[PDB]
Design a binder for this molecule. Structure first.
Ligand code: HEM
Ligand SMILES: *[C@@H]1CC(=O)N(CCCCCCN2C(=O)C[C@H](*)C2=O)C1=O
Ligand code: FES
Ligand SMILES: [Ca+2]
Lengths: 405, 106
């Protein structure tokens, strides 16, 4: 399933890689991508698959490209481009200076000050999920914890009723993990229709929740429209589900396979924040890209207007040019560099909320269930895409080894 | 080493900042909210604006042309000692450096 080769592309840079089905995926999705980083692979390849696109395979180029939006535009940041159809969340596809307007507003609903005063409320949530899960000695972490936790946090900061959760879950599910029983465009529209009367109602009778703030904010020097507010509110929901769900699963998979790293955090919980950062580098998982605004020589390669380039957020921290022994998880690693939250003006708005969800999940899980492991006879499968993930995480443990608090 | 953060209202915070850490990173990690650091430290947003005290402007590496470009769109008063503090990487020689944090970043 390959596309014809563009007259401006030399064949010696051509490289067979499909980001939805990489070859050695059974070893681990991060491993599978790292094939782009073997010794005889140029810093910049072309692939004929998924429509046809460039790939930056190295942290230096990825960061450079993410730093130059004049050449590398967010107008089409998904590969293949058809995956952009009906994707109109805000501010994903905007560039400065308009993009900035929506980041100022967003910072008011998920900036560090908001994260901080939500923390204790987040840990009681985390605890409650864990506490009422412990004497089972088993779980599908992915369904049992990774999914309910972030969506429950959204409800908390959006000020939405708990029984609204089944509905939103379904809708975001159809978006992320389609069923054939609903198109993404339909699921998206349903989410907007859920949001839009709440927005209008709270524009005229405000609270302190995320929706009120966004609905009552200004962008470009005039009031945010209902349309703008739902498209951004929509992304504050969707932006922090599939990525938190999957990152927590990669991480939790690692700890279930590695008693030595558990005991370290168990003997030294003070290390957990630093370990989270290391877990973020090693199990990075986003890969999107940019589109070319113009013809452009780039690191000795000629790109043309319309060309899409993939700029894997995942690969920078795995680039051994950037971290020695990259597949190694060392919680005392001294110079951790990565682009797990992205890079440039679009670097993740939820980064502070997402770090705090990780650190609390770790501080609260190990506090109660120190020893656990992967289910016996368990084929744990990774999937590869824009947000790579874990299919399921059956965990097993002995109830007498835990400690309720 | 140690870095002192002076808010617009005169309030004064001194922080112990590890070598290799940017003045932005240290601010965000310790509840210095008047430093936002939106882009996370690549001179892409201008929300980590600070005024570096004249006693340390000889001692900080000059800004690169990228930082200069971004500084044009700071929202607070742009001054000669204006810096993106995500571009200030901390070192022992910079111990006790003074930065004044402006009344706005957004
Ligand atoms: C470990 C968890 C997460 C990871 C790895 C992650 C990853 C990313 C990345 C790499 C980007 C930049 C995309 C690009 O440049 O094309 C991004 C953008 C964004 N993220 Fe996250 N994310 C996480 C959690 C969250 C959470 C919890 C939220 C909560 C609202 C969130 C909200 C957003 C939003 C609203 C954007 C749009 C940023 C923009 O274009 O200005 N993310 N995310
Ligand atoms: C951690 C990652 C990084 O790039 N970095 C700065 C590079 C200098 C090498 C460390 C030398 N060093 C010290 O030992 C203290 C201050 C300093 O620059 C890091 O520090
Ligand atoms: S944090 Fe974005 S320019 Fe300093
Ligand atoms: Ca409708």
């Amino acid at each position: 399933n390959l596309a014809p080769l563009p007259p401006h592309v030399p064949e010696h840079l051509v490289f067979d890689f499909d980001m939805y089905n990489p070859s050695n995926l059974s070893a681990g999705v991060q491993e599978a991508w790292a094939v782009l980083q073997e010794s005889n692979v140029p810093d910049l390849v072309w692939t004929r698959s998924n429509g046809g696109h460039w790939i930056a395979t190295r942290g230096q180029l990825i960061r450079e490209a993410y730093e130059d939006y004049r050449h590398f535009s967010s107008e089409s940041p998904f590969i293949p481009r058809e995956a952009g159809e009906a994707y109109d969340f805000i501010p994903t596809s905007m560039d400065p200076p308009e993009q900035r307007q929506f980041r100022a507003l967003a910072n008011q609903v998920v900036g560090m000050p908001v994260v901080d005063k939500l923390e204790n409320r987040i840990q009681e949530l985390a605890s409650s999920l864990i506490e009422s899960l412990r004497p089972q000695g088993q779980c599908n972490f992915t369904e049992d914890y990774a999914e309910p936790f972030p969506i429950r946090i959204f409800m908390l900061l959006a000020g939405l009723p708990e029984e609204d959760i089944p509905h939103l879950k379904y809708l975001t599910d159809q978006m992320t993990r389609p069923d054939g029983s609903m198109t993404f465009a339909e699921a998206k529209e349903a989410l907007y229709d859920y949001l839009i009367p709440i927005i209008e109602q709270r524009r005229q009778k405000p609270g302190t929740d995320a929706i009120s703030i966004v609905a009552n904010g200004q962008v470009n020097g005039r009031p945010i429209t209902s349309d703008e507010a739902k498209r951004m509110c929509g992304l504050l929901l969707v932006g922090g589900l599939d990525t938190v769900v999957n990152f927590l699963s990669f991480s939790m998979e690692f700890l279930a396979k590695s008693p030595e790293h558990r005991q370290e955090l168990i003997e030294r919980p003070e290390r957990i924040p630093a370990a989270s950062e290391e877990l973020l580098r090693r199990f990075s998982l986003v890969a999107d890209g940019r589109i070319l605004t113009s013809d452009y020589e780039f690191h000795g390669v000629q790109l043309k207007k319309g060309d899409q380039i993939l700029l894997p957020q995942m690969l920078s921290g795995l680039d051994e040019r950037e971290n020695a022994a990259p597949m190694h998880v060392d919680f005392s690693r001294q110079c951790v560099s990565h682009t797990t939250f992205g890079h440039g003006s679009h670097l993740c708005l939820g980064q502070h909320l997402a770090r705090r969800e990780i650190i609390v999940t770790l501080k609260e899980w190990l506090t109660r269930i120190p020893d656990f492991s992967i289910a016996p006879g368990a084929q744990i499968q990774h999937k590869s895409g824009i947000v790579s993930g874990v299919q399921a995480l059956p965990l097993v443990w002995d109830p007498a080894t835990t400690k309720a608090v | 080493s140690k870095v002192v953060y002076v808010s617009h209202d005169g309030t004064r915070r001194e922080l112990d900042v590890a070598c290799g850490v940017s003045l932005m990173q240290a601010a965000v990690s310790n509840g210095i909210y008047d430093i936002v650091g939106d882009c996370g430290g690549s001179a892409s947003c201008a929300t980590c604006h600070v005024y570096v005290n004249e006693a340390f402007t000889d001692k900080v590496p000059a800004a690169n042309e990228r930082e200069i470009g971004m500084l044009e769109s700071v929202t607070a008063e742009l001054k000669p000692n204006s810096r993106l503090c995500c571009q200030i990487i901390m070192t022992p020689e910079l111990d006790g450096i003074v930065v004044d944090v402006p009344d706005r970043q957004w």
